[PDB]
PDB file of C-alpha atoms (C1' of nucleotides) and ligand atoms in Angstrom:
ATOM      1  CA  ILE A   4       0.000   0.000   0.000  1.00 25.98           C
ATOM      2  CA  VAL A   5       1.002   3.593  -0.697  1.00 27.05           C
ATOM      3  CA  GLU A   6       1.199   6.176   2.086  1.00 24.09           C
ATOM      4  CA  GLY A   7      -0.515   3.830   4.612  1.00 21.53           C
ATOM      5  CA  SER A   8       0.382   2.058   7.880  1.00 22.14           C
ATOM      6  CA  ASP A   9       0.713  -1.253   9.706  1.00 22.16           C
ATOM      7  CA  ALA A  10      -2.299  -3.402  10.172  1.00 24.11           C
ATOM      8  CA  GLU A  11      -2.727  -4.225  13.799  1.00 22.07           C
ATOM      9  CA  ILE A  12      -3.114  -7.925  14.566  1.00 24.21           C
ATOM     10  CA  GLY A  13      -6.640  -8.975  13.549  1.00 22.68           C
ATOM     11  CA  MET A  14      -7.614  -5.797  11.656  1.00 22.56           C
ATOM     12  CA  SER A  15      -8.596  -7.903   8.655  1.00 23.48           C
ATOM     13  CA  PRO A  16      -9.366 -11.538   9.331  1.00 23.11           C
ATOM     14  CA  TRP A  17     -10.753 -11.697   5.735  1.00 19.98           C
ATOM     15  CA  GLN A  18      -7.604 -10.512   3.949  1.00 23.39           C
ATOM     16  CA  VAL A  19      -5.920 -13.409   2.220  1.00 21.72           C
ATOM     17  CA  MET A  20      -2.694 -13.493   0.139  1.00 22.54           C
ATOM     18  CA  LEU A  21      -2.467 -15.282  -3.182  1.00 21.49           C
ATOM     19  CA  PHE A  22       1.070 -16.579  -3.697  1.00 23.88           C
ATOM     20  CA  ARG A  23       2.890 -18.189  -6.531  1.00 21.91           C
ATOM     21  CA  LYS A  24       4.048 -21.758  -5.989  1.00 21.56           C
ATOM     22  CA  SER A  25       6.974 -21.520  -8.437  1.00 24.09           C
ATOM     23  CA  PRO A  26       8.651 -19.206  -8.572  1.00 24.27           C
ATOM     24  CA  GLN A  27       7.448 -19.078  -4.895  1.00 23.19           C
ATOM     25  CA  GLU A  28       6.294 -15.400  -4.754  1.00 25.92           C
ATOM     26  CA  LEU A  29       3.291 -13.294  -3.748  1.00 24.72           C
ATOM     27  CA  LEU A  30       0.998 -12.499  -6.669  1.00 23.96           C
ATOM     28  CA  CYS A  31      -1.950 -10.633  -4.980  1.00 24.64           C
ATOM     29  CA  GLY A  32      -4.527 -10.310  -2.281  1.00 25.16           C
ATOM     30  CA  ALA A  33      -7.932 -11.946  -1.800  1.00 28.36           C
ATOM     31  CA  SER A  34     -10.526 -11.622   0.841  1.00 24.69           C
ATOM     32  CA  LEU A  35     -12.150 -14.728   2.040  1.00 24.87           C
ATOM     33  CA  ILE A  36     -15.843 -14.346   2.047  1.00 25.89           C
ATOM     34  CA  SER A  37     -16.292 -17.723   3.831  1.00 27.17           C
ATOM     35  CA  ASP A  38     -14.746 -20.949   5.116  1.00 27.46           C
ATOM     36  CA  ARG A  39     -14.397 -21.996   1.434  1.00 28.56           C
ATOM     37  CA  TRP A  40     -14.692 -19.332  -1.306  1.00 28.38           C
ATOM     38  CA  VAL A  41     -12.188 -16.402  -1.774  1.00 29.73           C
ATOM     39  CA  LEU A  42     -12.730 -13.138  -3.780  1.00 32.22           C
ATOM     40  CA  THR A  43      -9.668 -12.028  -5.852  1.00 34.75           C
ATOM     41  CA  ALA A  44      -9.466  -9.864  -9.018  1.00 37.34           C
ATOM     42  CA  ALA A  45      -8.919 -11.804 -12.344  1.00 35.86           C
ATOM     43  CA  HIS A  46      -6.116  -9.843 -13.798  1.00 36.87           C
ATOM     44  CA  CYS A  47      -4.118 -11.636 -11.011  1.00 37.42           C
ATOM     45  CA  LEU A  48      -4.726 -14.958 -12.719  1.00 38.19           C
ATOM     46  CA  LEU A  49      -5.323 -13.809 -16.287  1.00 40.61           C
ATOM     47  CA  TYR A  50      -3.702 -10.887 -18.113  1.00 42.30           C
ATOM     48  CA  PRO A  51      -2.970 -12.267 -21.538  1.00 42.22           C
ATOM     49  CA  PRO A  52      -1.008  -9.052 -22.488  1.00 38.13           C
ATOM     50  CA  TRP A  53       1.750  -9.980 -19.967  1.00 38.74           C
ATOM     51  CA  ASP A  54       1.284 -13.629 -19.914  1.00 40.49           C
ATOM     52  CA  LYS A  55      -0.629 -13.720 -16.662  1.00 41.99           C
ATOM     53  CA  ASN A  56      -2.465 -17.052 -16.835  1.00 41.84           C
ATOM     54  CA  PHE A  57      -2.303 -19.038 -13.737  1.00 39.48           C
ATOM     55  CA  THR A  58      -4.125 -22.012 -12.709  1.00 39.35           C
ATOM     56  CA  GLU A  59      -5.359 -23.600  -9.577  1.00 42.22           C
ATOM     57  CA  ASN A  60      -2.152 -25.588  -9.985  1.00 43.24           C
ATOM     58  CA  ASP A  61       0.151 -22.568 -10.129  1.00 45.72           C
ATOM     59  CA  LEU A  62      -1.347 -20.786  -7.109  1.00 45.85           C
ATOM     60  CA  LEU A  63      -1.301 -21.116  -3.317  1.00 41.56           C
ATOM     61  CA  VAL A  64      -3.656 -19.554  -0.792  1.00 39.48           C
ATOM     62  CA  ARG A  65      -2.656 -18.401   2.602  1.00 41.71           C
ATOM     63  CA  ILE A  66      -5.143 -17.195   5.085  1.00 42.89           C
ATOM     64  CA  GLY A  67      -4.490 -15.375   8.294  1.00 43.70           C
ATOM     65  CA  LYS A  68      -1.422 -13.309   7.486  1.00 42.49           C
ATOM     66  CA  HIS A  69       0.407 -10.268   8.788  1.00 42.30           C
ATOM     67  CA  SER A  70       4.109 -10.651   8.103  1.00 38.16           C
ATOM     68  CA  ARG A  71       4.626 -10.108   4.418  1.00 38.51           C
ATOM     69  CA  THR A  72       7.756 -12.342   4.774  1.00 38.41           C
ATOM     70  CA  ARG A  73       7.962 -15.036   7.464  1.00 39.68           C
ATOM     71  CA  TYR A  74       5.687 -18.012   7.442  1.00 41.10           C
ATOM     72  CA  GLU A  75       3.395 -17.101  10.446  1.00 41.51           C
ATOM     73  CA  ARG A  76       3.851 -20.352  12.309  1.00 42.19           C
ATOM     74  CA  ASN A  77       0.759 -20.860  14.394  1.00 40.98           C
ATOM     75  CA  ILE A  78      -1.510 -18.254  12.916  1.00 42.00           C
ATOM     76  CA  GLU A  79      -1.439 -18.263   9.113  1.00 43.47           C
ATOM     77  CA  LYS A  80      -3.073 -21.036   7.182  1.00 45.33           C
ATOM     78  CA  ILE A  81      -2.286 -22.287   3.616  1.00 44.00           C
ATOM     79  CA  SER A  82      -4.833 -23.685   1.127  1.00 42.38           C
ATOM     80  CA  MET A  83      -5.208 -25.231  -2.266  1.00 40.62           C
ATOM     81  CA  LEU A  84      -7.614 -24.242  -4.912  1.00 39.95           C
ATOM     82  CA  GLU A  85     -10.263 -26.579  -6.293  1.00 39.27           C
ATOM     83  CA  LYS A  86     -11.355 -24.124  -8.959  1.00 39.83           C
ATOM     84  CA  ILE A  87     -11.266 -20.571 -10.141  1.00 39.34           C
ATOM     85  CA  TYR A  88     -14.132 -18.851 -11.918  1.00 35.29           C
ATOM     86  CA  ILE A  89     -13.305 -15.779 -14.000  1.00 34.91           C
ATOM     87  CA  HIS A  90     -16.255 -13.657 -14.899  1.00 33.61           C
ATOM     88  CA  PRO A  91     -17.506 -14.437 -18.360  1.00 32.51           C
ATOM     89  CA  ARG A  92     -17.417 -10.727 -19.390  1.00 30.05           C
ATOM     90  CA  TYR A  93     -13.959 -10.214 -17.795  1.00 30.32           C
ATOM     91  CA  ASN A  94     -12.420  -7.680 -20.273  1.00 29.04           C
ATOM     92  CA  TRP A  95      -8.599  -7.842 -20.150  1.00 31.02           C
ATOM     93  CA  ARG A  96      -8.063  -6.313 -23.526  1.00 30.75           C
ATOM     94  CA  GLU A  97      -9.799  -2.883 -23.189  1.00 32.29           C
ATOM     95  CA  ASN A  98     -10.274  -1.506 -19.678  1.00 30.94           C
ATOM     96  CA  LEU A  99     -10.732  -4.275 -17.098  1.00 32.90           C
ATOM     97  CA  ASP A 100     -14.644  -4.388 -16.669  1.00 31.61           C
ATOM     98  CA  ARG A 101     -15.942  -6.992 -14.134  1.00 32.41           C
ATOM     99  CA  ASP A 102     -12.329  -7.620 -13.256  1.00 31.77           C
ATOM    100  CA  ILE A 103     -13.500 -10.214 -10.774  1.00 31.35           C
ATOM    101  CA  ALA A 104     -12.699 -13.796 -10.085  1.00 31.40           C
ATOM    102  CA  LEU A 105     -13.680 -16.290  -7.366  1.00 32.10           C
ATOM    103  CA  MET A 106     -11.694 -19.418  -6.554  1.00 35.09           C
ATOM    104  CA  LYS A 107     -12.988 -22.063  -4.253  1.00 35.49           C
ATOM    105  CA  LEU A 108     -10.328 -23.326  -1.870  1.00 38.00           C
ATOM    106  CA  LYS A 109      -9.921 -27.070  -1.868  1.00 39.00           C
ATOM    107  CA  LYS A 110     -11.436 -27.618   1.645  1.00 38.15           C
ATOM    108  CA  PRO A 111     -12.734 -25.357   4.428  1.00 41.78           C
ATOM    109  CA  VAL A 112     -10.796 -22.805   6.420  1.00 44.24           C
ATOM    110  CA  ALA A 113     -11.218 -22.910  10.121  1.00 43.62           C
ATOM    111  CA  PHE A 114     -12.103 -19.585  11.634  1.00 42.67           C
ATOM    112  CA  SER A 115      -9.926 -17.882  14.245  1.00 40.45           C
ATOM    113  CA  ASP A 116      -8.915 -14.729  16.020  1.00 39.31           C
ATOM    114  CA  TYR A 117      -7.135 -14.268  12.776  1.00 37.50           C
ATOM    115  CA  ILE A 118      -9.425 -15.867  10.092  1.00 37.76           C
ATOM    116  CA  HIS A 119     -12.826 -14.407   9.664  1.00 38.10           C
ATOM    117  CA  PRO A 120     -14.949 -13.733   6.649  1.00 40.38           C
ATOM    118  CA  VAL A 121     -16.139 -10.342   5.398  1.00 43.26           C
ATOM    119  CA  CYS A 122     -19.655  -9.179   4.808  1.00 46.08           C
ATOM    120  CA  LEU A 123     -20.866  -9.078   1.238  1.00 47.39           C
ATOM    121  CA  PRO A 124     -22.696  -5.823   0.414  1.00 48.34           C
ATOM    122  CA  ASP A 125     -26.491  -5.675   0.511  1.00 46.65           C
ATOM    123  CA  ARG A 126     -28.773  -3.852  -1.812  1.00 46.18           C
ATOM    124  CA  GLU A 127     -29.516  -1.555   1.071  1.00 43.06           C
ATOM    125  CA  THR A 128     -25.973  -1.115   2.469  1.00 41.72           C
ATOM    126  CA  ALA A 129     -24.789  -0.552  -1.086  1.00 37.17           C
ATOM    127  CA  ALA A 130     -27.219   2.304  -1.385  1.00 37.94           C
ATOM    128  CA  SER A 131     -26.240   4.051   1.888  1.00 37.82           C
ATOM    129  CA  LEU A 132     -22.536   3.446   2.094  1.00 38.99           C
ATOM    130  CA  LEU A 133     -21.239   4.003  -1.440  1.00 37.94           C
ATOM    131  CA  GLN A 134     -21.056   7.718  -1.386  1.00 36.04           C
ATOM    132  CA  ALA A 135     -18.442  10.249  -2.226  1.00 34.24           C
ATOM    133  CA  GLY A 136     -16.251  11.497   0.579  1.00 31.14           C
ATOM    134  CA  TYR A 137     -17.155   8.465   2.668  1.00 32.83           C
ATOM    135  CA  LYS A 138     -13.917   6.615   3.547  1.00 32.51           C
ATOM    136  CA  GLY A 139     -13.193   2.853   2.710  1.00 32.95           C
ATOM    137  CA  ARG A 140     -10.352   0.668   4.041  1.00 33.95           C
ATOM    138  CA  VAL A 141      -7.951  -1.076   1.568  1.00 35.11           C
ATOM    139  CA  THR A 142      -5.123  -3.543   2.495  1.00 37.71           C
ATOM    140  CA  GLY A 143      -1.871  -5.398   2.002  1.00 39.07           C
ATOM    141  CA  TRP A 144       1.647  -6.312   1.018  1.00 40.51           C
ATOM    142  CA  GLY A 145       2.051  -4.065  -2.054  1.00 39.41           C
ATOM    143  CA  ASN A 146       4.702  -1.679  -3.372  1.00 34.96           C
ATOM    144  CA  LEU A 147       5.425   1.077  -0.753  1.00 34.08           C
ATOM    145  CA  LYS A 148       6.052   3.311  -3.808  1.00 34.93           C
ATOM    146  CA  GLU A 149       5.230   3.086  -7.402  1.00 34.17           C
ATOM    147  CA  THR A 150       8.605   1.883  -8.361  1.00 32.57           C
ATOM    148  CA  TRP A 151      11.855   1.983  -6.398  1.00 33.49           C
ATOM    149  CA  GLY A 152      10.390  -1.155  -1.343  1.00 34.03           C
ATOM    150  CA  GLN A 153       7.731  -3.376   0.126  1.00 32.50           C
ATOM    151  CA  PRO A 154       6.432  -3.975   3.577  1.00 29.67           C
ATOM    152  CA  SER A 155       7.278  -6.738   5.973  1.00 30.36           C
ATOM    153  CA  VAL A 156       3.751  -5.971   7.166  1.00 30.33           C
ATOM    154  CA  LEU A 157       0.226  -5.591   5.867  1.00 28.86           C
ATOM    155  CA  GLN A 158      -0.553  -1.943   5.190  1.00 30.09           C
ATOM    156  CA  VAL A 159      -3.947  -0.361   5.738  1.00 29.61           C
ATOM    157  CA  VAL A 160      -4.901   2.966   4.207  1.00 26.66           C
ATOM    158  CA  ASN A 161      -8.101   4.995   4.755  1.00 26.43           C
ATOM    159  CA  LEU A 162      -9.268   6.527   1.491  1.00 24.96           C
ATOM    160  CA  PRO A 163     -12.374   8.358   0.344  1.00 24.21           C
ATOM    161  CA  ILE A 164     -14.658   7.233  -2.512  1.00 26.79           C
ATOM    162  CA  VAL A 165     -14.443   9.836  -5.293  1.00 22.19           C
ATOM    163  CA  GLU A 166     -17.283  11.480  -7.299  1.00 25.38           C
ATOM    164  CA  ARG A 167     -18.426   9.284 -10.246  1.00 25.45           C
ATOM    165  CA  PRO A 168     -17.390  11.951 -12.833  1.00 28.01           C
ATOM    166  CA  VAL A 169     -14.114  13.016 -11.257  1.00 27.66           C
ATOM    167  CA  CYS A 170     -12.856   9.384 -11.489  1.00 26.54           C
ATOM    168  CA  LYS A 171     -13.577   9.882 -15.147  1.00 26.43           C
ATOM    169  CA  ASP A 172     -11.610  12.837 -16.401  1.00 27.60           C
ATOM    170  CA  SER A 173      -8.697  11.180 -14.707  1.00 27.81           C
ATOM    171  CA  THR A 174      -8.088   8.482 -17.233  1.00 24.27           C
ATOM    172  CA  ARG A 175      -8.280   8.183 -20.954  1.00 20.58           C
ATOM    173  CA  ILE A 176      -9.189   4.660 -19.848  1.00 22.04           C
ATOM    174  CA  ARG A 177     -12.753   4.028 -20.809  1.00 20.27           C
ATOM    175  CA  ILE A 178     -14.306   3.663 -17.282  1.00 18.08           C
ATOM    176  CA  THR A 179     -17.527   1.630 -16.559  1.00 17.57           C
ATOM    177  CA  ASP A 180     -20.196   0.729 -14.130  1.00 16.86           C
ATOM    178  CA  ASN A 181     -18.457  -2.144 -12.476  1.00 16.98           C
ATOM    179  CA  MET A 182     -15.793   0.374 -11.491  1.00 19.16           C
ATOM    180  CA  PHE A 183     -15.530   2.882  -8.576  1.00 18.65           C
ATOM    181  CA  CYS A 184     -12.515   5.195  -8.031  1.00 19.28           C
ATOM    182  CA  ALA A 185     -11.133   6.032  -4.582  1.00 19.37           C
ATOM    183  CA  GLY A 186      -9.267   9.040  -3.306  1.00 21.01           C
ATOM    184  CA  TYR A 187      -7.813  11.990  -1.537  1.00 20.83           C
ATOM    185  CA  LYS A 188      -8.168  14.898  -3.967  1.00 19.72           C
ATOM    186  CA  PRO A 189      -5.074  16.708  -5.095  1.00 18.53           C
ATOM    187  CA  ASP A 190      -5.304  19.500  -2.758  1.00 21.36           C
ATOM    188  CA  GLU A 191      -7.369  17.475  -0.117  1.00 24.10           C
ATOM    189  CA  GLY A 192      -4.118  17.337   2.005  1.00 22.85           C
ATOM    190  CA  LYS A 193      -3.749  13.568   2.700  1.00 22.61           C
ATOM    191  CA  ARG A 194      -2.366  10.550   0.754  1.00 21.70           C
ATOM    192  CA  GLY A 195      -2.392   6.811   0.033  1.00 23.77           C
ATOM    193  CA  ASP A 196      -3.438   4.432  -2.732  1.00 22.62           C
ATOM    194  CA  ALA A 197      -3.072   0.715  -3.404  1.00 27.31           C
ATOM    195  CA  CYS A 198      -0.298  -0.470  -5.718  1.00 26.03           C
ATOM    196  CA  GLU A 199       1.540  -2.796  -8.059  1.00 28.00           C
ATOM    197  CA  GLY A 200       1.122  -5.915  -5.877  1.00 28.44           C
ATOM    198  CA  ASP A 201      -2.131  -4.886  -4.179  1.00 26.26           C
ATOM    199  CA  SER A 202      -4.879  -6.226  -6.466  1.00 24.78           C
ATOM    200  CA  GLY A 203      -7.697  -8.554  -5.355  1.00 23.62           C
ATOM    201  CA  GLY A 204      -7.449  -6.690  -2.060  1.00 25.82           C
ATOM    202  CA  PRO A 205     -10.663  -5.812  -0.262  1.00 27.17           C
ATOM    203  CA  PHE A 206     -11.856  -2.202  -0.012  1.00 29.94           C
ATOM    204  CA  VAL A 207     -13.968  -2.509   3.156  1.00 30.31           C
ATOM    205  CA  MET A 208     -16.652  -0.488   4.923  1.00 30.52           C
ATOM    206  CA  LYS A 209     -18.460  -0.661   8.263  1.00 27.54           C
ATOM    207  CA  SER A 210     -22.220  -0.169   8.468  1.00 25.94           C
ATOM    208  CA  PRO A 211     -22.900   2.045  11.475  1.00 24.54           C
ATOM    209  CA  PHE A 212     -26.120  -0.093  11.350  1.00 26.96           C
ATOM    210  CA  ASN A 213     -24.750  -3.290  12.851  1.00 28.64           C
ATOM    211  CA  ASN A 214     -21.122  -2.277  12.940  1.00 28.49           C
ATOM    212  CA  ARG A 215     -20.152  -5.278  10.821  1.00 29.06           C
ATOM    213  CA  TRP A 216     -17.760  -4.623   7.855  1.00 28.89           C
ATOM    214  CA  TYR A 217     -18.387  -4.992   4.078  1.00 28.36           C
ATOM    215  CA  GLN A 218     -16.469  -5.486   0.806  1.00 32.66           C
ATOM    216  CA  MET A 219     -17.405  -2.616  -1.502  1.00 29.81           C
ATOM    217  CA  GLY A 220     -14.460  -2.563  -3.863  1.00 29.91           C
ATOM    218  CA  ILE A 221     -11.654  -4.819  -4.990  1.00 30.73           C
ATOM    219  CA  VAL A 222      -8.271  -3.358  -6.072  1.00 34.73           C
ATOM    220  CA  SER A 223      -8.209  -3.122  -9.809  1.00 36.75           C
ATOM    221  CA  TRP A 224      -6.088  -0.705 -11.617  1.00 36.28           C
ATOM    222  CA  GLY A 225      -5.165   2.922 -11.816  1.00 34.91           C
ATOM    223  CA  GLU A 226      -2.150   4.631 -13.196  1.00 33.08           C
ATOM    224  CA  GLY A 227       0.860   4.579 -10.816  1.00 33.65           C
ATOM    225  CA  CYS A 228       0.509   4.765  -7.055  1.00 34.46           C
ATOM    226  CA  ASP A 229      -0.679   7.939  -5.608  1.00 39.19           C
ATOM    227  CA  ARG A 230      -0.068  10.050  -8.653  1.00 39.06           C
ATOM    228  CA  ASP A 231      -1.426  13.474  -7.998  1.00 42.95           C
ATOM    229  CA  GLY A 232      -4.638  13.560  -9.999  1.00 45.24           C
ATOM    230  CA  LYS A 233      -4.829   9.795 -10.164  1.00 46.98           C
ATOM    231  CA  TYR A 234      -7.313   7.495  -8.408  1.00 48.29           C
ATOM    232  CA  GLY A 235      -7.291   3.768  -7.905  1.00 50.11           C
ATOM    233  CA  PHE A 236     -10.193   1.907  -9.539  1.00 51.44           C
ATOM    234  CA  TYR A 237     -11.809  -0.918  -7.540  1.00 52.64           C
ATOM    235  CA  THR A 238     -14.468  -3.471  -8.498  1.00 50.70           C
ATOM    236  CA  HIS A 239     -18.052  -2.722  -7.773  1.00 49.01           C
ATOM    237  CA  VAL A 240     -18.444  -5.905  -5.694  1.00 47.95           C
ATOM    238  CA  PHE A 241     -22.094  -4.920  -5.228  1.00 48.38           C
ATOM    239  CA  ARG A 242     -22.675  -4.272  -8.909  1.00 50.23           C
ATOM    240  CA  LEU A 243     -21.525  -7.878  -9.493  1.00 48.58           C
ATOM    241  CA  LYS A 244     -23.185  -9.597  -6.514  1.00 49.65           C
ATOM    242  CA  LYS A 245     -25.638 -11.471  -8.604  1.00 49.87           C
ATOM    243  CA  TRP A 246     -23.066 -13.553 -10.498  1.00 47.11           C
ATOM    244  CA  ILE A 247     -21.112 -13.487  -7.333  1.00 44.55           C
ATOM    245  CA  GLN A 248     -23.982 -15.388  -5.687  1.00 41.60           C
ATOM    246  CA  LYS A 249     -24.961 -17.542  -8.688  1.00 39.18           C
ATOM    247  CA  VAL A 250     -21.866 -19.735  -8.469  1.00 41.06           C
ATOM    248  CA  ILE A 251     -21.417 -20.124  -4.844  1.00 39.59           C
ATOM    249  CA  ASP A 252     -25.000 -21.431  -5.074  1.00 39.88           C
ATOM    250  CA  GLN A 253     -24.185 -23.768  -7.913  1.00 39.10           C
ATOM    251  CA  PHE A 254     -21.007 -25.478  -7.244  1.00 40.57           C
ATOM    252  CA  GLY A 255     -20.070 -24.071  -4.004  1.00 39.63           C
ATOM    253  CA  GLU A 256     -19.167 -24.703  -0.422  1.00 41.58           C
TER     254      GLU A 256
ATOM    255  CA  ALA B  15     -23.919 -15.442   9.129  1.00 45.39           C
ATOM    256  CA  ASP B  16     -21.530 -13.713  11.424  1.00 47.67           C
ATOM    257  CA  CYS B  17     -19.817 -12.065   8.503  1.00 49.78           C
ATOM    258  CA  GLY B  18     -17.604  -9.011   9.059  1.00 47.57           C
ATOM    259  CA  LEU B  19     -17.289  -8.645  12.842  1.00 45.06           C
ATOM    260  CA  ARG B  20     -13.744  -9.041  14.082  1.00 44.56           C
ATOM    261  CA  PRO B  21     -12.914 -11.518  16.818  1.00 45.36           C
ATOM    262  CA  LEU B  22     -10.523  -9.121  18.603  1.00 41.55           C
ATOM    263  CA  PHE B  23     -12.094  -5.887  17.452  1.00 44.33           C
ATOM    264  CA  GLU B  24     -15.878  -5.562  17.319  1.00 47.72           C
ATOM    265  CA  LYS B  25     -15.995  -8.991  18.953  1.00 46.64           C
ATOM    266  CA  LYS B  26     -14.475  -7.658  22.137  1.00 46.14           C
ATOM    267  CA  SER B  27     -15.942  -4.188  21.928  1.00 44.20           C
ATOM    268  CA  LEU B  28     -12.585  -2.610  21.221  1.00 45.08           C
ATOM    269  CA  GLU B  29     -12.030  -0.498  18.105  1.00 45.23           C
ATOM    270  CA  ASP B  30      -8.927  -0.018  15.956  1.00 46.27           C
ATOM    271  CA  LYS B  31      -6.883   3.153  16.017  1.00 47.97           C
ATOM    272  CA  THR B  32      -8.539   4.182  12.705  1.00 46.86           C
ATOM    273  CA  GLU B  33     -11.961   2.542  12.422  1.00 46.70           C
ATOM    274  CA  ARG B  34     -13.134   5.917  13.746  1.00 47.16           C
ATOM    275  CA  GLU B  35     -11.858   7.916  10.752  1.00 49.10           C
ATOM    276  CA  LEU B  36     -14.427   5.821   8.905  1.00 49.37           C
ATOM    277  CA  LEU B  37     -17.686   6.488  10.822  1.00 50.80           C
ATOM    278  CA  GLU B  38     -16.672  10.199  10.929  1.00 52.06           C
ATOM    279  CA  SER B  39     -16.878  10.224   7.158  1.00 51.01           C
ATOM    280  CA  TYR B  40     -20.590   9.420   7.049  1.00 51.84           C
ATOM    281  CA  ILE B  41     -20.922  12.390   9.430  1.00 53.50           C
TER     282      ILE B  41
ATOM    283  C1'  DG C   4      16.159 -22.923  11.769  1.00 57.90           C
ATOM    284  C1'  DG C   5      11.774 -24.351  10.110  1.00 56.78           C
ATOM    285  C1'  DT C   6       7.194 -24.380   4.846  1.00 54.10           C
ATOM    286  C1'  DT C   7       9.602 -19.384   8.573  1.00 54.36           C
ATOM    287  C1'  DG C   8      13.210 -13.587  10.666  1.00 52.48           C
ATOM    288  C1'  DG C   9      15.044 -11.953  14.042  1.00 48.83           C
ATOM    289  C1'  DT C  10      14.325  -6.937  17.079  1.00 47.00           C
ATOM    290  C1'  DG C  11      16.821 -14.523  18.589  1.00 47.79           C
ATOM    291  C1'  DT C  12      12.837 -18.376  22.659  1.00 48.30           C
ATOM    292  C1'  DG C  13       8.830 -13.564  22.352  1.00 46.31           C
ATOM    293  C1'  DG C  14       5.400 -12.440  19.433  1.00 47.92           C
ATOM    294  C1'  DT C  15      -0.090 -12.810  16.105  1.00 47.53           C
ATOM    295  C1'  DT C  16       3.093 -19.294  18.364  1.00 43.68           C
ATOM    296  C1'  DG C  17       6.961 -24.002  20.418  1.00 43.50           C
ATOM    297  C1'  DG C  18      10.989 -24.816  21.990  1.00 43.20           C
TER     298       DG C  18
HETATM  299  C1  0G6 D  22      -2.967  -6.235  -9.431  1.00 43.06           C
HETATM  300  C2  0G6 D  22      -2.717  -5.041  -9.232  1.00 43.06           C
HETATM  301  O1  0G6 D  22      -2.054  -4.674  -8.226  1.00 43.06           O
HETATM  302  C3  0G6 D  22      -3.099  -3.797  -9.984  1.00 43.06           C
HETATM  303  C4  0G6 D  22      -3.766  -2.767  -9.074  1.00 43.06           C
HETATM  304  C5  0G6 D  22      -2.889  -1.509  -9.074  1.00 43.06           C
HETATM  305  C6  0G6 D  22      -3.534  -0.211  -9.361  1.00 43.06           C
HETATM  306  N1  0G6 D  22      -3.064   0.905  -8.556  1.00 43.06           N
HETATM  307  C7  0G6 D  22      -3.816   1.693  -7.771  1.00 43.06           C
HETATM  308  N2  0G6 D  22      -3.091   2.547  -7.010  1.00 43.06           N
HETATM  309  N3  0G6 D  22      -5.163   1.609  -7.615  1.00 43.06           N
HETATM  310  N4  0G6 D  22      -3.797  -4.020 -11.254  1.00 43.06           N
HETATM  311  C8  0G6 D  22      -3.139  -3.692 -12.363  1.00 43.06           C
HETATM  312  O2  0G6 D  22      -1.997  -3.159 -12.333  1.00 43.06           O
HETATM  313  C9  0G6 D  22      -3.856  -3.944 -13.712  1.00 43.06           C
HETATM  314  C10 0G6 D  22      -3.534  -5.308 -14.278  1.00 43.06           C
HETATM  315  C11 0G6 D  22      -2.627  -5.083 -15.440  1.00 43.06           C
HETATM  316  C12 0G6 D  22      -2.411  -3.592 -15.616  1.00 43.06           C
HETATM  317  N5  0G6 D  22      -3.211  -2.960 -14.587  1.00 43.06           N
HETATM  318  C13 0G6 D  22      -3.268  -1.688 -14.246  1.00 43.06           C
HETATM  319  O3  0G6 D  22      -4.046  -1.256 -13.374  1.00 43.06           O
HETATM  320  C14 0G6 D  22      -2.380  -0.745 -15.061  1.00 43.06           C
HETATM  321  N6  0G6 D  22      -1.501   0.017 -14.114  1.00 43.06           N
HETATM  322  C15 0G6 D  22      -3.140   0.180 -15.970  1.00 43.06           C
HETATM  323  C16 0G6 D  22      -4.180  -0.519 -16.808  1.00 43.06           C
HETATM  324  C17 0G6 D  22      -3.922  -0.701 -18.149  1.00 43.06           C
HETATM  325  C18 0G6 D  22      -4.816  -1.387 -18.920  1.00 43.06           C
HETATM  326  C19 0G6 D  22      -6.067  -1.757 -18.398  1.00 43.06           C
HETATM  327  C20 0G6 D  22      -6.364  -1.514 -17.060  1.00 43.06           C
HETATM  328  C21 0G6 D  22      -5.415  -0.875 -16.271  1.00 43.06           C
END
DNA sequence: GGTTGGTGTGGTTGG
């Protein structure tokens, strides 16, 4: 994360790290939305323009982290995928629309002081929470700057959802409805953004209705990390719930 | 069920050092 | 070390 801080133990029991088998490296973040399914972005598994095309084979899933580095001995828990489901309209060529993927872990993850699922947005919550100026909470083991170096710890950043239009005149990228930008305006006097390494990460919110937390976004793209005038684009998790719940109720856990 | 309620944070009625930035947004 | 680093047996945990 860029211009953020350390996660305190158990800040994000949902937050999951995707991590290459061989070459054994981190590829992204996920958020577990339950003892079996995990929410990641697709471009983490499939970006044909850079040869990103992993498979269930190729990936590793480790739930309950904090240290970016060490293998968190009695906390962190490592899982194997059973299957990945990119979104049929995933659009890797153009602009990244419905840049969402699921992946069902092989077998269930025990919950714990450290492992806990996040709330999926409801029609109602979606309505009330997604509003400009309202902060969101994004997370992980990503570049500490654009280019340089990386944390030894999870970083958390508090960033404000940006006006629909403003996101827009920010990129010649052809923005869509399954996209929501997030930021501190140029002159708003405060920084942070997600970054190369960040993606699949959850962009959470807390209903002051029940005080539970929700996934609004997903880390998706943007140009650089904390460029002045640039805002990270997430995935309208809401916008895509429907498919999101079609599959878990299909061939799920 | 008992989605998004942290076992050491909401779960024990403590809040994080920044949660609070977040409900102050909503005004 | 170790499926781990070391701020080195403590910690988000053994020994
Ligand atoms: C996986 C990722 O970390 C990443 C998210 C980073 C975005 N940064 C911020 N601060 N929000 N996703 C990507 O980098 C995707 C996948 C491949 C390229 N890409 C980008 O976001 C590019 N930086 C720009 C882009 C080009 C083409 C289409 C979409 C985005």
